[PDB]
Amino acid sequence: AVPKKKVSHQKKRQKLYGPGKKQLKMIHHLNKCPSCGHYKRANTLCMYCVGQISHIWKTHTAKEEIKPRQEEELSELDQRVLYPGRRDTKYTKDLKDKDNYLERRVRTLKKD
């Protein structure tokens, strides 16, 4: 149940890169988005076109933010004396830097 001899360069390579199943395949099923105009996968939907429509829904069916009447009537001075600034920890500071561990999808290339 253990290797009896070190596996040579030849055996290792032909085992991993030899067969056709282990090697990844060319993506031949790409089409042109009827709406976006760019590349898209066959029998799927264009993410950008889907994304922008979802954006339209979001901005037209968004719930108004709850802004209590009490807060907007306070002067800057009362806000400072009543809601002083506070310092954030390393975990909290890193969490706000969301551009270092979250990233948006990439716009697909255009198909002619």
Binding site: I66, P68, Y83, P84
Partner: protein, 217 residues
């Protein structure tokens, strides 16, 4: 053995007049760590009142501890009659129950929410509770007075109800709040608590001395 003290039960008006321990008035205390507020019928408060007031404690409105070092008296309201004092105490407690259990959803949207959607806090201190107590006291007082208002001399001109804050800052503006005609009808006066000695250290002597003055007769 007298296990039961003056503060164990809820003392009605009949008890107060027979005993006459204090003039008709309701003390309002605040907590200096969690920022919560406790309503008391006496200058002293114990665990029974805390339990009867914080019935629905969660990570935001945690149940406070009966550690006297972090409780301070915020406002002492004096009322013309003992019936008024008892009626105010009941009204204040009802709002706390409504605001904590019955109508928590509608109370929440009125509170100030910071980023992440939580109620604003600097540590475990949330000022919204103190502000809520002031607003509830104003509303309870208004509902207390509207029920009974002789508008005349029944037997003797009643003493003008008054209010005793620690500092004028705690109460809101005198114009957009605490300016309804009803209060002016009874001549509610906004007065400040005597501030010479160690307030917290010598609160008991202050409250009695203010109690004697309140009972002018």
């Amino acid at each position: 053995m007298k296990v039961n003290h003056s503060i164990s039960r809820f003392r009605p008006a009949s008890w107060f007049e027979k005993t006459k321990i204090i003039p008709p008035q309701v003390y309002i205390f605040r907590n200096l760590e969690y920022g919560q507020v406790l309503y008391s019928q006496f200058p002293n408060f114990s665990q029974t009142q805390v339990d009867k007031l914080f019935v629905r404690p969660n990570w935001s409105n945690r149940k406070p501890s009966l550690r006297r070092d972090i409780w301070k008296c915020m406002c002492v309201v004096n009322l013309q009659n003992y019936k008024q004092s008892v009626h105010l105490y009941q009204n204040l407690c009802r709002l706390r129950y409504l605001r904590d259990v019955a109508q928590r959803k509608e109370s929440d949207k009125l509170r100030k929410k910071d980023s992440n959607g939580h109620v604003w806090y600097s540590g475990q201190y949330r000022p919204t509770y103190c502000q809520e107590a002031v607003a509830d006291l104003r509303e309870s007082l208004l509902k207390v007075f509207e029920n009974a208002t002789p508008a005349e001399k029944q037997t003797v001109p009643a003493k003008k109800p008054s209010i005793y804050w620690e500092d004028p800052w705690r109460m809101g503006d005198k114009d957009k709040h605490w300016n309804y005609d009803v209060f002016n009808a009874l001549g509610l006066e906004h007065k400040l608590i005597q501030r010479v000695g160690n307030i917290a250290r010598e609160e008991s002597v202050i409250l009695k001395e203010l109690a004697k003055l309140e009972s002018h007769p």
